[PDB]
Amino acid sequence: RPRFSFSIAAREGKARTGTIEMKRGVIRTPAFMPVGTAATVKALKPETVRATGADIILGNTYHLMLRPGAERIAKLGGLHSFMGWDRPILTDSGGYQVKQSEEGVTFKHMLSPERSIEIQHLLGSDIVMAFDECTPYPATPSRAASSMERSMRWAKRSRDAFDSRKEQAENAALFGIQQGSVFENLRQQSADALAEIGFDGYAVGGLAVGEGQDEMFRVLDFSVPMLPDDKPHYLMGVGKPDDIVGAVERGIDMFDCVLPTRSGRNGQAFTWDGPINIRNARFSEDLKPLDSECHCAVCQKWSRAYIHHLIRAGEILGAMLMTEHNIAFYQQLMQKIRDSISEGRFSQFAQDFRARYF
Amino acid sequence: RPRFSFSIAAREGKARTGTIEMKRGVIRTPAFMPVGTAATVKALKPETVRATGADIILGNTYHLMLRPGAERIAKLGGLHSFMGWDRPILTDSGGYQVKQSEEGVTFKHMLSPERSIEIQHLLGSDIVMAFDECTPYPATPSRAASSMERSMRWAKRSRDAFDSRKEQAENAALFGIQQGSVFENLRQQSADALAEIGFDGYAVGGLAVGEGQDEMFRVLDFSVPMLPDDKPHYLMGVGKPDDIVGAVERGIDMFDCVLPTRSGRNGQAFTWDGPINIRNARFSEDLKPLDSECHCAVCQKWSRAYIHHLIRAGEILGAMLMTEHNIAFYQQLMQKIRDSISEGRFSQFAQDFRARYF
Ligand SMILES: CNc1nc2cc3nc[nH]c(=O)c3cc2[nH]1
Numbered sequence: 001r002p003r004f005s006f007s008i009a010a011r012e013g014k015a016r017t018g019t020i021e022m023k024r025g026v027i028r029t030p031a032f033m034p035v036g037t038a039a040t041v042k043a044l045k046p047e048t049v050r051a052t053g054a055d056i057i058l059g060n061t062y063h064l065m066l067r068p069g070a071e072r073i074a075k076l077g078g079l080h081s082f083m084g085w086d087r088p089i090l091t092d093s094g095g096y097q098v099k100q101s102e103e104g105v106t107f108k109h110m111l112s113p114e115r116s117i118e119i120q121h122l123l124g125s126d127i128v129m130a131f132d133e134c135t136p137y138p139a140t141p142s143r144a145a146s147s148m149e150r151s152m153r154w155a156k157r158s159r160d161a162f163d164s165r166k167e168q169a170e171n172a173a174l175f176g177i178q179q180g181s182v183f184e185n186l187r188q189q190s191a192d193a194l195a196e197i198g199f200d201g202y203a204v205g206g207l208a209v210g211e212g213q214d215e216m217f218r219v220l221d222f223s224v225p226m227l228p229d230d231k232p233h234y235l236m237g238v239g240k241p242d243d244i245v246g247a248v249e250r251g252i253d254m255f256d257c258v259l260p261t262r263s264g265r266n267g268q269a270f271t272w273d274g275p276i277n278i279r280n281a282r283f284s285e286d287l288k289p290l291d292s293e294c295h296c297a298v299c300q301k302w303s304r305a306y307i308h309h310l311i312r313a314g315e316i317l318g319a320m321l322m323t324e325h326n327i328a329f330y331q332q333l334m335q336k337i338r339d340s341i342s343e344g345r346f347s348q349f350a351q352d353f354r355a356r357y358f
Numbered sequence: 359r360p361r362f363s364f365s366i367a368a369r370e371g372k373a374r375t376g377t378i379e380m381k382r383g384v385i386r387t388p389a390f391m392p393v394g395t396a397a398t399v400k401a402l403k404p405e406t407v408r409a410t411g412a413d414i415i416l417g418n419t420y421h422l423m424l425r426p427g428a429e430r431i432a433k434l435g436g437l438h439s440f441m442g443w444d445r446p447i448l449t450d451s452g453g454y455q456v457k458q459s460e461e462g463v464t465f466k467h468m469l470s471p472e473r474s475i476e477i478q479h480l481l482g483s484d485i486v487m488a489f490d491e492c493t494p495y496p497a498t499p500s501r502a503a504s505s506m507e508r509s510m511r512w513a514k515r516s517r518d519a520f521d522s523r524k525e526q527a528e529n530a531a532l533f534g535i536q537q538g539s540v541f542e543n544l545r546q547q548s549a550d551a552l553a554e555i556g557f558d559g560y561a562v563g564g565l566a567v568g569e570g571q572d573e574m575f576r577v578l579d580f581s582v583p584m585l586p587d588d589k590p591h592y593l594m595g596v597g598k599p600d601d602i603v604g605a606v607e608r609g610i611d612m613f614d615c616v617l618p619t620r621s622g623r624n625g626q627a628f629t630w631d632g633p634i635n636i637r638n639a640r641f642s643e644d645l646k647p648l649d650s651e652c653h654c655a656v657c658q659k660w661s662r663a664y665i666h667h668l669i670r671a672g673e674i675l676g677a678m679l680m681t682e683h684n685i686a687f688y689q690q691l692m693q694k695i696r697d698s699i700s701e702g703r704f705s706q707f708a709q710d711f712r713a714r715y716f
């Protein structure tokens with residue numbers, strides 16, 4: 001397999017379906033990446049994660065740079081070996097979860113573009129995120145521009161730190177991140193700068209930070225066409241199933257979110273009829289599975305009623321089952337999306353989905 | 359399969375190895391029963407429990423009689439269907455975890471022999487425990503005798519409540535429980551009363567309540583020979599691996615304990631070299647599996663170092679992996695015990711085990 005090769009197999013409007021080939025495996029796009037916070041996709045064995053259909057996971061950098069520390073994980077053979085996931089891993093830069101200066105950030109420890117790229121290397125990341133600044137929402141145009149310009153400078157620093165490590169450069173990919181808040185001209189200048197630097201992929205940063213779905217979609221409308229067509233488009237931190245469907249309709253290829261895991265643990269189950277909270281007393285004697293159509297193992301063997309009991313009782317198996325279901329649901333969503341694009345009926349899928357989901 | 363048939367295949371001294379055949383499956387003896395507290399073996403899917411080698415589990419009655427309630431579980435199809443374990447289940451009487459009278463116990467609700475047997479029926483238990491009184495330790499001879507006599511009266515009540523329900527009588531088994539504290543004459547009178555009533559199996563109650571291993575073994579020395587030879591002997595709530603080995607040497611066939619699950623969750627891993635606490639910093643970079651010889655999936659794929667990280671971080675996968683390992687270890691212990699008895703080298707196994715374990 002090549003280091004990185006993104007190929008688009010089919011299109012419908014702005015939507016695309018295809019594959020990213022990497023040394024550690026193939027990634028079907030549009031892709032959902034389950035989130036590994038501290039070297040684990042919470043409450044799931046990696047083989048379970050794979051079984052749900054995930055091709056790649058996101059490893060959070062922030063907690064692991066703390067403990068056990070990037071250097072220790074490197075000593076132990078890297079993140080893949082440590083956690084037992086042998087397929088691609090996208091690592092974030094660790095800066096989003098974190099004294100600000102042009103050099104980088106210091107916190108209660110200094111994190112700069114260079115250190116970030118180094119930590120992602122020590123972890124053995126397949127897809128490395130440039131180190132940026134996620135502009136708070138709302139932002140004045142001046143602040144958004146200052147923030148964006150700093151991010152582009154840090155993007156160039158990222159690129160050069162990555163490229164100055166031959167094993168990283170040869171075996172991993174680097175994604176750049178677009179900023180600009182909700183301002184079209186800043187988004188354009190940022191797309192321009194990132195393309196000039198050149199990356200393997202382009203994320204749309206700065207969204208899903210409180211602007212709400214209408215505003216996010218309005219920004220995506222003009223921002224995604226500004227990115228190189230021939231590379232993957234990653235919408236960081238999104239999101240709800242409906243967010244994902246609209247974002248694919250606007251050209252996004254990749255997604256990550258804690259919603260399916262975190263909200264699973266809290267009792268929220270995704271269904272094609274919309275989300276349910278399994279702790280509600282209405283499920284105490286409901287022998288139906290979480291969802292009527294879901295093909296996951298949880299829906300094949302256990303009832304709402306049992307999972308209701310488990311979550312109410314604080315039992316770990318409740319977290320395990322809810323999470324497996326929710327990640328499986330997300331993967332089934334992405335599969336339906338890929339299939340519908342491949343078959344030229346994605347617009348109809350999107351309408352049908354929303355009608356039933358709501 | 360018959361309702362209940364215990365057959366002894368081999369002996370060495372007081373030790374026995376054999377099988378209990380029941381409608382829902384075969385139980386290899388000496389047997390360890392993982393504990394299901396509230397319709398779950400904590401942090402494990404039933405298929406994982408089975409995979410470790412368990413033939414039967416113990417379902418705690420106390421929490422489930424609370425919520426969801428025995429009646430609701432019966433409505434939902436019984437405990438086996440609810441939790442997804444289709445093999446035998448031994449249910450306790452619910453009284454041990456719980457205003458005392460000859461009628462039964464009231465608590466913050468009244469539990470009597472009759473209600474207990476009824477709840478175990480509603481749950482659909484394969485092996486039903488008579489409702490007793492576990493005499494506190496230490497106990498004066500007068501108190502121990504009063505307690506024991508009450509338990510024998512409740513044992514007769516148990517027997518008759520069980521027998522007065524035809525589907526229970528036809529499809530499940532009933533075990534009686536011996537009391538008498540540490541007094542040989544009371545233990546004898548209790549064995550006598552239980553045999554006169556007649557049960558499918560006989561538990562040694564009243565131990566593992568603070569008397570310590572020497573005293574427990576001294577009591578077992580005289581108490582187990584008092585029970586019918588041709589029925590299984592169950593030592594309730596035991597125990598540590600060394601406790602189990604000595605108890606088999608004294609004629610016990612069945613065991614349950616929360617140590618492997620509960621202590622697993624707390625960081626304690628059982629090894630043939632003795633238990634370890636994985637949170638100790640000595641394991642932070644130890645790439646060895648929990649145990650050098652263990653055949654479990656956890657030891658096949660993950661390091662001490664990773665599990666160390668997981669437990670320190672409070673991650674659910676840490677509970678999952680520690681528990682699977684520990685239950686697998688317990689099952690491997692019982693297998694070694696069965697094999698050594700079958701081969702007439704159990705006494706040597708016991709010595710070798712203790713030498714290395716300590
Ligand atoms: C959950 N929403 C959300 N998670 C994000 C992570 C991010 N990382 C780097 N850069 C970002 O702009 C950024 C924006 C984000 N929004």
Ligand SMILES: CNc1nc2cc3nc[nH]c(=O)c3cc2[nH]1
Binds near residue numbers: 454493562564566596
């Ligand atoms: C953990 N020790 C322990 N768990 C027990 C459960 C019991 N149940 C019924 N009757 C008992 O005598 C009894 C004794 C016990 N000791």
Ligand SMILES: [Zn+2]
Binds near residue numbers: 294299325329
């Ligand atoms: Zn499902």
Ligand SMILES: [Zn+2]
Binds near residue numbers: 654656658
């Ligand atoms: Zn093991």
